[PDB]
């Protein structure tokens, strides 16, 4: 059944190198859903962060329609190994490092719906660059983004659009694996840009990270007040015993330096 | 089964000389598949009792493409989880007190996927924190007291003690 349906699609002349046809010659519309699994290693020195997400792409390829109306056949067929299919050559413009997960079997899923609609799902681990602004360092908020766009195909061939309903989703155990920050807000936007090689469609998801304060309260503010307050208890020593005063003022000052370092 | 580890951040198969896999095909059609895998898993930890805490780390296992109508995972009936004898000896900082074998099947937007979950319980060794934190701090606080026995006229001595122990206290904590 399924193996036969697949065989019927690739027994004819099908070229995975050729872009799927369109009714009006328009571009291939690729809907994108994105599921963040974990956001970790938020490096402030190199201004980058790691994040593991599930990319989900969906487009229409009439050539792959087998059931059409169906209603007698299976809704969709899982694409097995050894069958090539044209896919959006999407990449992450601000990715510095990327890994696909291939443990045991590669972590991918491709479905071919009867009408020719394709669902593509893949796990990807990224290390993205995220320029940060430390004006209010201790109590700051940073905004980190994942950009997504086609590399070779221009605006006449491929166009990205965020899924209409819940384009960005978070796994439940995301905030719990992110102890240092608090993921307050997310946004889903477009970043299409015009380059020297053409106009390329582009999506951009954005998370907003609010730095946890409890640490800096205990490891910076509290201890410094406690240090400054100590420098005051020398105002209560007789003016004759200056050694005591200096020892206090000097020690607290030195310690102040250390802590800051 | 295209199984993967949902909470794996990094994974390596061992391929030294020949790849470390074993596949057996029993006469009845039963298949045995064995493979060595090195993982780096995410394990959210809770440090409320930091010095004397216990963490629970898990390895999740599920199919990626196949849904609940095609593939279903079940833990072996007898001893689903086993430990090599030299595991606790290669784990000096903690003590693997308890293990559990559970299911984590979940319903997603792409379907309902079968899922297993093994869980180890790690109890942090205390000997280190006794010697490197508690003992030395008591020893530090006790020193601040020996200034109560210096004559009230020699305040330089008192301050030097109280101040030094305080500074050191800071350092140690840092």
């Amino acid at each position, epitope marked *: 059944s399924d193996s036969k349906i697949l065989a019927h699609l690739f027994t004819s002349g099908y070229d995975f190198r050729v872009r799927p046809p369109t009714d009006n010659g328009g571009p291939v519309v690729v809907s994108v859903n994105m599921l963040l699994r974990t956001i970790s290693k938020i490096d402030v020195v190199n201004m980058e962060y790691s994040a593991q997400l599930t990319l989900r792409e969906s487009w229409i390829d009439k050539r792959l329609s087998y059931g059409v109306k169906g209603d007698g056949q299976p809704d969709f067929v899982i694409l097995t190994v050894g069958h090539q299919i044209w896919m959006p050559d999407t990449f992450f413009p601000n990715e510095k490092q990327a890994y696909k997960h291939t443990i045991d079997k590669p972590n991918v899923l491709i479905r071919i719906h009867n009408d020719g609609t394709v669902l593509y799902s893949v796990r990807i681990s990224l290390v993205l660059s995220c320029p940060m602004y430390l004006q209010y360092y201790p109590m700051d908020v940073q905004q980190c983004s994942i950009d997504l766009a086609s590399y070779a195909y221009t605006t006449k061939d491929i166009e990205y659009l965020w899924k209409e*309903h*819940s384009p960005l*989703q978070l796994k*439940v155990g995301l905030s719990s694996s992110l102890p240092s920050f608090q993921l307050t807000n997310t946004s889903t936007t477009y970043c299409t840009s015009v380059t020297n090689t053409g106009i390329y469609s582009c999506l951009r998801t954005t998370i907003q990270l609010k730095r946890e304060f409890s640490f800096y309260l205990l490891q910076l503010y509290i201890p410094s007040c406690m240090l400054v307050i100590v420098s005051w208890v020398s105002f209560w020593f007789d003016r004759t015993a200056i050694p005591a005063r200096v020892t206090l003022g000097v020690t607290t000052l030195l310690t102040m330096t250390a802590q800051s370092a | 089964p295209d199984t993967f580890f949902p909470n794996e951040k990094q994974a390596y198969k061992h391929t030294i000389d020949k790849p470390n896999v074993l596949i057996r095909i029993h006469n009845d059609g039963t298949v045995l598949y064995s493979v060595r895998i090195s993982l780096v898993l995410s394990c959210p930890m809770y440090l409320q009792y930091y010095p004397m805490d216990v963490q629970q780390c898990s390895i999740d296992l599920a199919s990626y493409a196949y*849904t*609940t*109508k095609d593939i*279903e995972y*079940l833990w072996k009936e007898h001893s689903p989880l086993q430990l090599k004898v030299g595991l606790s000896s290669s784990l000096p900082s903690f003590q693997l007190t308890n293990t559990s074998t559970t*299911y*984590c*099947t*979940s*319903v*997603t*937007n*792409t*379907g*309902i996927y079968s899922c297993l979950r093994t869980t180890i319980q790690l109890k942090r060794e205390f000997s280190f924190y006794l010697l490197q934190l508690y003992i030395p701090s008591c020893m530090l606080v006790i020193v601040s007291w020996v200034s109560f026995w210096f004559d009230r006229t020699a305040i330089p001595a008192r301050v030097t003690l109280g101040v030094t122990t305080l500074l050191t206290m800071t350092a140690q904590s840092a």
Partner: antibody
Amino acid sequence: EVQLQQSGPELVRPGASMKISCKASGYSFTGYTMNWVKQSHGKNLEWIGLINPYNGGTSYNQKFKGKATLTVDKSSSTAYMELLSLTSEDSAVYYCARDGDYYRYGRYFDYWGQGTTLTVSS
Amino acid sequence: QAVVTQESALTTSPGETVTLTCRSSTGAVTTINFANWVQEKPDHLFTGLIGGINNRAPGVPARFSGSLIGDKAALTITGAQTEDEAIYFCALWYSNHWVFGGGTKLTVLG
């Protein structure tokens, strides 16, 4: 204590379509997936489908594919169920039953609603 | 297609031990059927008892217990009580959906 309060009884003519609700309270609504069960006088209990509040994800019984449409409103902690092209056969009592596991599918029933009686007659 | 079968009705006295059974038509009830047991008190009061792998609903009395006696799912009430008189439906999971039984009307004699 947890509770699943469903909408009142409804009388609708064939061809029309109505929507019954199931307001959850006493638990983190978005943590447990909801089942819908149909108890008709003519047959036994039938499993319609289920929905994951947190996920929006749904899975229907092949039988009710196109007859029922499970949705969920996180803000009001309410699970809804649409029934299209209502006919004589749709005259039944529709229950909503929670799944047992916390933020995962356990495949076992917790609490049910009092049920909603739908009468489709002409 | 696949059908679930239960005893039409059963009788037992307060204190005794009764056992309801749930049969699959496709074969033996295995663990991947996740046999569920539901109770229906008069006036349409449904509540879960057992299900899943070997987990139970919150508050389900200790006297209730599940097993796979023979090649069908069982629900054993050890020390039946007066209030235990109700209709018990068992449900099996076939691949991707639930299938209920005809239900068993357990009567605790009075």
